[model samples]
Target: FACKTANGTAIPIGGGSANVYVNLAPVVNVGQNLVVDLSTQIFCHNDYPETITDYVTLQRGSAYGGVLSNFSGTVKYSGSSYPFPTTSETPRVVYNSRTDKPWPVALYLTPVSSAGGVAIKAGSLIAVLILRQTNNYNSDDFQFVWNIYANNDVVVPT
Candidate 1:
C-alpha cells in the first residue's frame, strides 16, 4: 500500500536535521501498486550554505524505527525561491509476495549538517495513500495510522 502527505505541507530535504514523519497507516495492505505522492516546502537555516549532499529517508515509523527507503536521488522540489530553497522528493516502495508483510510506514527527513537548521513551513506536509492488490488476498483486516514529529513536537491533522 502507498500513502501521501497532505497538500501545501512543507518538508525539509536536508541531512543531520530533524526527521519529518509522514504517517502511512491509513492505507496499508489495501491493494497492489500502492503509490503515494508527497508535497512540502523546503527551507534552509539562516547563515548556512545550501548543500546537495543532504539526503532524506522514508522510514516505517518514528525516528526509533526501520527505514523504508532513502529519497536522495528520487525527490522533485516544487514552488519558487523562498526563505532558502525548495525541492520535492518522491520515495516509493514496492512489496511483492516474496516480501509481503504487515508493517507500519512513515517518512524521516535528516539534514547533513548538524550546524544548520531545516525548517518545514508550518502545515506544509502532504501525503496520499494508495493500495493495490495483485493476488487474491483479504486486505480489509489491515489498518494504517500516521504520526508526524518535528522539532521534538508531534503534528496531527484534525
Candidate 2:
C-alpha cells in the first residue's frame, strides 16, 4: 500500500495509482488546528487478501522540530467485506525528540487484519486517518515519514 499525507480531507484514486499532496507548505495561526488526512491505496496493480495483516507507521523526518502536537486521529476503511482489517490493536503515538527511544514523534496506525482473508479490492481505501494538528511552534519543520511493513514471508526478497 502507498500512503500519503494531505492538508485536508481528500480522496484516493485508481487503487494505489493516484494521490494528491495537499498543502505541502501550510501556514496555520497559533493555537489553530490544522487538519491532515492520511490515506492509502491497497494495490495500484492488484488487490490484497482480506486476512492480510500489516502495519503502517508514521514518524518524523530527519529535519525535526516540535511543531505539531501529538496527532489525534480516527480510522475508517472502505470495504464491503465482513471482518475487515482494523486499527484496534493498541495504536501508539509518541511525538517526542528522544535519542534513547526509537521512533520518536510517530503514530502507529491501527494494524490491518481480517478474519479468513477476504478479497480487498484493488481500488479501495484500506486506511483513512484524519489527524488534527496543533502547534505553538512558528518555524519551518519537515514532519512525518511513513513506512509499511508486511509479513516477511509474503514480501520476500522484494
Candidate 3:
C-alpha cells in the first residue's frame, strides 16, 4: 500500500518511511510481516547540525506498552562506517508469528543528549510501517507523530 506524509510527500508505506495502519476489526491472519522505514534526517530539528546519535523505537500498544523493536546505534559525521549529513536512511522492522498478537503499534525516534533533542541540517528523516493482513489478526487504525527536539547540541555533519 501507499501512504502520504502530512506535508504531502508521496512515499511507499510497505517498504519506505511510511507507517502502516491496519484496521483490527477485519481480523488479520498469521504469518504476516510488518515493515517500518524510519528516516532520521527529515525529522531532525533545524536548529542544530544534521548529526544524530540516537535510537528509534517500535512499541506495541498495551497496558505495559511493550517494545516490539529498537534501532539504536552510533552515527558519525563522515566515513563509510557511519555516514552523516546525507539524505534520510530507511530502517525496517518485521512482524512474524511471534508478533501476531492483536495490538496497536507506535514508532518513535529519540536523540540522546543531555538536553534531550535532535540536531537538524539539510536532510530529513522518514519512517515507514507495514502490517501484513492475516486470517486471525488485523488492525483498526494506526497513527504516527514526528517528534523533533530543538535543544540538541551541534555536531559536525559528515
Candidate 4:
C-alpha cells in the first residue's frame, strides 16, 4: 500500500494500527488531490484466494469542518480483469456535527464471490483512490484517519 501526492512525494502511513490520524500537510500543501495506490502485494500474501472484504473511510478527526470532494474510485479484484461490485449506498459527502466537520469519502470494495475466493497475482492494481481536498478552516484542521480493512480485520503484510 502506498500514498503519493500530486507532486509524487510519498507519505508514510502508520502500520498495524487502527484510528491513526495521519497529517495531510505534506500532500495538501503540494496540491489538493490525495492518491492512495494499493499494490497487489497487499492482498497477494496470506489473504490470497480469500474474499477481501475491504472498505476505506476518510475521517476528518476532531478538527474543524472541511470538504473532500470528487469522491470516486475503482477498486479491483487482486487480478487484473475483475472489479469489485459497487455498493448500493452511492458515494457522497457525509456531514457530521459532532466533529464540527464532515465525514469524508467512504469506499467499499465488495468480496470476490460467494462460493469461494480466487488467487490474486502480485503486481496488480488492487485499489486506487483519487480525492480532492477543500478546507473551510485552516489546512491543519483537516487531518485524516484512514480506516482500511478486510473481512478478518487483519492487516495484510506489505
TM-score of each: 0.22, 0.23, 0.21, 0.23
Candidate 1 lDDT over residue span 6-97, tens digit each: 33232222112232344332222212112222334122221112321212223222222111121111222222211111132224222332
The models' CA-based lDDT, in order, is: 0.25, 0.23, 0.25, 0.24
Per-residue lDDT over 82-109 for candidate 4, one digit per residue giving the tens place of the 0 to 100 score: 2222332223232222212222332222
Model 3 residue 148 lDDT score: 23
Best by lDDT: 1
Please state every model's RMSD to the true fold in angstroms: 19.8, 20.3, 19.3, 18.8
TM-score of 3: 0.21
What is the clash tally of candidate 4? 0
lDDT of 3 by residue, 1-158 (tens): 23343344433322243332221111111222212222322221111113321222222121101111112222322122221112343232322322112222333222222211122221222222232211113232233332221222223112
Model 2 per-residue lDDT tens digits across residues 46-132:
013233222223211211111111122232222111111223322333223211112212222221222112222222222322221
What pairs collide in candidate 4? none
Candidate 4 segments exceeding 4 Å error: 1-96, 99-134, 139-141, 153-158
Instruction: Identify the runs in model 1 with alpha carbons over 4 angstroms from their true place.
Output: 1-103, 126-129, 137-158
lDDT at residue 146 of model 4 (Cα atoms):
32
Question: How close to the true structure is residue 101 of candidate 2, measured as C-alpha lDDT?
Answer: 19
lDDT comparing candidate 1 with the true structure: 0.25
Reference-based TM-score, model 1: 0.22
